[PDB]
Amino acid sequence: SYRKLGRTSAQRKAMLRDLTTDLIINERIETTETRAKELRSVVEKMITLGKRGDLHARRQAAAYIRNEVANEENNQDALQKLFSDIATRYEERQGGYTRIMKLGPRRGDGAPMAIIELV
Amino acid sequence: AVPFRRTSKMKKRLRRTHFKLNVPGMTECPSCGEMKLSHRVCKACGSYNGKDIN
Amino acid sequence: TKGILGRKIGMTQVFAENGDLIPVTVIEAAPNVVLQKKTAENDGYEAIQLGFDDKREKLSNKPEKGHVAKAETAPKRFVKELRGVEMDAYEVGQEVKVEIFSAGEIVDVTGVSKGKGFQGAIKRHGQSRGPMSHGSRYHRRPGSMGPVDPNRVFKGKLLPGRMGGEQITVQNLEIVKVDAERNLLLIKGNVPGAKKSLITVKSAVKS
Amino acid sequence: MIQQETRLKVADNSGAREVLTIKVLGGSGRKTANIGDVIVCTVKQATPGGVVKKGEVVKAVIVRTKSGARRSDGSYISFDENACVIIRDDKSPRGTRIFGPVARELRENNFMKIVSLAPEVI
Amino acid sequence: QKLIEDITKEQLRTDLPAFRPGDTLRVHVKVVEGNRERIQIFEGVVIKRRGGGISETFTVRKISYGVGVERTFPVHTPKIAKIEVVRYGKVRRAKLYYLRELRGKAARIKEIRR
RNA sequence: UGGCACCUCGAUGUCGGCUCAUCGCAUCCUGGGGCUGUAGUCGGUCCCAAGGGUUGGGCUGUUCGCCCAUUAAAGCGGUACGCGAGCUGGGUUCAGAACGUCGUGAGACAGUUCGGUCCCUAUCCGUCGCGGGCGCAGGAAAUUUGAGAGGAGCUGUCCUUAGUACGAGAGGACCGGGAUGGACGCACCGCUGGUGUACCAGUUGUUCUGCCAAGGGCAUCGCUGGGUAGCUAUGUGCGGACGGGAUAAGUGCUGAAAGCAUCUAAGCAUGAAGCCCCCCUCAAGAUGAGAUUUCCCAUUCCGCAAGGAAGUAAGAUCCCUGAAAGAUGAUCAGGUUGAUAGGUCUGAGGUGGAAGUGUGGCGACACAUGGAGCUGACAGAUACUAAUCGAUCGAGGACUUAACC
């Protein structure tokens, strides 16, 4: 199955969207372990849509990828970055564009943390 | 719903036997070993399979 | 008596020669190898051990490999006994296949039901609810706990707890078809257990 | 499924128009009746000109039910109406004609004087 | 579930024509009344097509004498002589449950043909 | 039911419903018998038997009772109304507000409408489930016997036997075979359904993506039509079968005391839904700690002495990937001589005919794609990503004694 992450069905979707949009821009994040484990699947699904490279694809991804500037001095939307750079970067791999690396706990509430990045 | 009698010291001490915590599962790093946690990247020099990430 | 063991695959249907539909369960079987023999003088009773579904070398220790040295086969995953058999016509290392069962025979099947976890009184024991209106404050909870005179609770009161996951036997089940090439059995009905479990298939002993 | 206090209209020319059930015969706690069964029931609404009137307790046989009837070969039948005919001791009916299709899961019992006078026995 | 496919491949039928949920047809079932065997004909509209293997089932609804009668069959039953298709139908869904309360000329589906 | 008055405590809340029940037999049904004023069919009455079973509504009254329709039957009683830190004060229980009959009067009994707002986070013993220690006298991995305990235990019609036995007649069998039901229990999702908030499609208002087309947010998941896995019944499969041993009330065989007789005092039989086995489940903490098969070897230091330390072997655990398991522990499948999860391909299933581009359209729209662009829990391939390196524990057969050897 999947995990509910302690949110309602409508905030879970928004949080997943925000995380998958930030990962594209920053190339590496750090969140909890459960969030990373539930995020890698959606991010991998999005990458493949981009690799296809069509108008239907572009439009499907558009209805999920938040609209934030991904590169200054280039007026590059995050969608344009996804369909331009990453697709050529991983043009030969067959799946598995992510890796998760664990760290120590957190001081405030003892949560376990992890770093998720693109490979 | 209210205790009938007070609790002695023997019963209290007997009940507290399982209220304890264990040692962590930890091992040192090949490069500048600093006795980190197993399957985790250390924060000073326990360089996980390469560089020391943090 | 007679019997073998295998896994369980799923459920389906079969149209009989009278164009009648009957549910069906599938058993995997595969050849079974006898591993040991127990005698009245040496052990106190008569039985034979069975082996099934060998595993790779890394998953077995040294006593296990020593035990199957006599039967001259690879280590096996499942082993269990079967009492009441004719002690002859059986040697250590011999093979036993699905042909021992005929098309129309009757059989008992034993397994382990699926787990259900911590369940309540109404589901675990099939009790009744209280009314849900008319100023009632008693819906799904266990009943009274007995009289006042004994000053205690009897042994045998029924309360919530972990439910399922025990050993069950279902008797008087027919066989439909035997498929020797793939080592298959086609029972008629349902059988305790999840998918990919261990099922014992023994000949019927009346009831 | 038919229980106590279930409106259920007659499908023959006896005089009644609508009939409510009282008890399901057979058994010592039987709760529901499926098809091809007998029930004792009263008459709530009736035609002025006939042989049966209001308030009279009689016996009837179930003919149609919205719940289906399974068959050995695996096929099902189902309707959109609950209907019954009137009978008396011997399974011969009181009326002379039956209106509507009649389920054939009524054949196994001794209900021939019923099947005969009815179209579409299905 | 592959093993089930190899087990039951043989009993599948290779005769029936292809039809859709909105479609009028006519089935040829065999009735063994007593000792005699007579072929009865059912004619009506298709309502449902939920299946998936050796276990598909289609329902056909008709009306006779003012009472709506339904019959459900398995697709691969060996009590079926043959299946026809009389008319086609232009419909917009796969489960036509709205045809139950609706009656009169509010019924009747558009015919596609060619 | 009275009489009488011993523990009245910050009280000796008394009766009907709900949820769960247990015990007696002085037997309502089912099993076995003796007498009849017992031709059969049906009865009456009296013994032996407590394993199982023993119902849905209307009437006002909470009670007692009267009725309607069924069934094999709708049994009497005890457990502080059996059960209010489990529900209903329902009516006991107040009273507080008002509405006839007796009071000079204050008021006292009316019969009726309204009210009580009522509380409790379980310490100990009891119950129901799940773990951690140590023991079983080398250390380990598996397979088991059964002292003992629990569960189950119910009944109706129809067809034969046979319109036969019996009986003027009407009527109508014992014993024995065969089908098919009701209530109850255990498993399961192939079928008929239910739900199915990260599946598909239509649509109202108002905002946002600079505009058109295409989309996102909010409005009970905005509303409506369908639905995969898993969980489920009202759905499907199966069960209470057949027999042994000793008996109860009974029926008896030979047989004396008592030349006869006599179920008995010697002795030997038959005889029940009771009893002990037969069927299903748990079971060696059964300190009486049981049995069989397979591995490891008898190292190194101190201590004359018993003994005490240190590395290990066979074997495990810590740690990590997960679910056929699960509150948490536990159980189970795997750790790079690997398919344990995710991804990527190829499928099964669900919804159903995408967008873009034509073409025909005044338009509102339709036709050419697709029976596929869309697809979360379901299969088969494939090391692309993650299960790295390491660390802790674990024996020298305790101890003799006799017989055997």
Nearest C-alpha neighbor of A90 from the set A57, A50, A38: A50
Please, what is the end-to-end C-alpha distance for chain B in angstroms?
53
**Which secondary structure element, helix H or strand E, spans residue C16, and what is its range?**
none
> How far apart, in Å, are the Cα atoms of C85 and each of A18, C32, C203, E66?
68, 15, 11, 66
Angle between helices A33-52 and A9-26 (to 10 degrees): 70
Cα gap C198→C191, rounded to integer Å: 11
Cα gap C202→C200, rounded to integer Å: 6
Query: Smallest CA–CA separation between C12 and chain E, in Å?
Result: 8
Q: Give me the residues paired with residue D43 across strands.
A: D19
Cα gap C31→C98, rounded to integer Å: 8
Residue E39 CB neighbours (<10 A): 10
For residue C70, what is the DSSP state? T
Query: Smallest CA–CA separation between C192 and chain D, in Å?
Result: 25
Rounded CA Rg of chain A:
15
Cα gap C143→C130, rounded to integer Å: 10
**Coil, strand or helix: which one is C124?**
helix
Interface test with E, best of D35, D78, D104 (most E CBs within 10 A): D78
Q: Is the C-alpha dihedral spanning A104, A108, A109, A113 positive or negative?
A: negative
Asked if the C-beta of C10 comes within 8 angstroms of chain E's C-beta atoms, the answer is: yes
Q: What ranges do the domains of chain D cover?
A: 1-122
Q: Give me the residues paired with residue A53 across strands.
A: none
For residue A85, what is the DSSP state? I
Contact A114, A33 (CB under 8 A): yes
Please, which positions of strand F sit below 7 A from a protein CB?
A: 18-22, 55-56, 68-74, 79-80, 82-83, 85-89, 120-131, 140-146, 150-151, 181-193, 197-198, 209, 214-219, 221-222, 225-229, 231-232, 235-242, 279-282, 291-296, 314-316, 318-320, 322, 324-327, 334-335, 337-339, 342-345, 348-356, 367, 371, 373-380, 384-391
**Which secondary structure element, helix H or strand E, spans residue A24, and what is its range?**
helix A9-26
Cα gap A19→A42, rounded to integer Å: 10
Q: Judged by CB atoms within 8 Å, which residues 76-115 of A form the interface with B?
A: 101-104, 115
Nearest C-alpha neighbor of E75 from the set E96, E53, E91: E53
Cα gap A80→A58, rounded to integer Å: 9
DSSP string over E25-89: EEEEEEE--TT--EEEEEEEEEEE----SS--EEEEEEEETTEEEEEEEETT-TTEEEEEEEE--
Q: What ranges do the domains of chain A cover?
A: 1-119
Within 13 Å of residue A115, how many CA atoms lie on the same side as its CB? 16
For residue C189, what is the DSSP state? S
Using an 8 Å CB-CB cutoff, list chain D residues near C19: 73
Q: Do E71 and D75 touch (CB under 8 A)?
A: yes
Interface test with E, best of C7, C17, C20, C21 (most E CBs within 10 A): C21
Q: Do E67 and D81 touch (CB under 8 A)?
A: yes
Contact E2, C9 (CB under 8 A): no
Tell me which residue has tokens 């000329």: E105
**Residue B34 region, left (φ>0) first, then alpha (ψ -120 to 50), else beta?**
alpha
Cα gap C132→E32, rounded to integer Å: 52
Residue C4 CB neighbours (<10 A): 23
CA A21 to chain centre: 6
Resolution (A): 2.8
Residues 6 or more apart from D14 whose CB is under 8 A from it? D50, D51, D52, D86, D94, D95
Residues 6 or more apart from C27 whose CB is under 8 A from it? C6, C7, C8, C9, C184, C185, C186, C187, C199, C201
Query: Smallest CA–CA separation between E25 and chain D, in Å?
Result: 17
Domain that holds residue B45: 2-54
Cα gap C8→C16, rounded to integer Å: 22
**Coil, strand or helix: which one is C37?**
strand
- The spacing between the Cα labelled CA in C8 and the C1' in F281, in angstroms, equals 23
Side chain identity at D101, as an amino acid letter? P
Rounded CA Rg of chain B:
22
Instruction: Write the burial class of residue D83 (CB in 10 Å: 0-12 exposed, 13-18 middle, 19+ buried).
Output: buried
Elucidation technique? cryo-EM
- The spacing between the Cα labelled CA in B23 and the C1' in F308, in angstroms, equals 29
Strand nucleotide closest to residue A57 (CA to C1'):
F373
**Which secondary structure element, helix H or strand E, spans residue A56, and what is its range?**
helix A55-62
Contact C177, C90 (CB under 8 A): no
Phi then psi dihedrals of residue A77, to 5 deg: -70, 150
Using an 8 Å CB-CB cutoff, list chain C residues near E54: 12-13
Asked if the C-beta of C26 comes within 8 angstroms of chain E's C-beta atoms, the answer is: yes
Cα gap E57→E50, rounded to integer Å: 6
The chain E residue lying nearest D100, using CA atoms, is E65
Contact E109, E90 (CB under 8 A): yes
**Coil, strand or helix: which one is D97?**
coil
Q: Is the C-alpha dihedral spanning E6, E12, E17, E22 positive or negative?
A: negative
DSSP string over D20-56: EEEEE-SSSS---B-SS-EEEEEEEEE-SSSS--TT-
Using an 8 Å CB-CB cutoff, list chain C residues near E79: 19
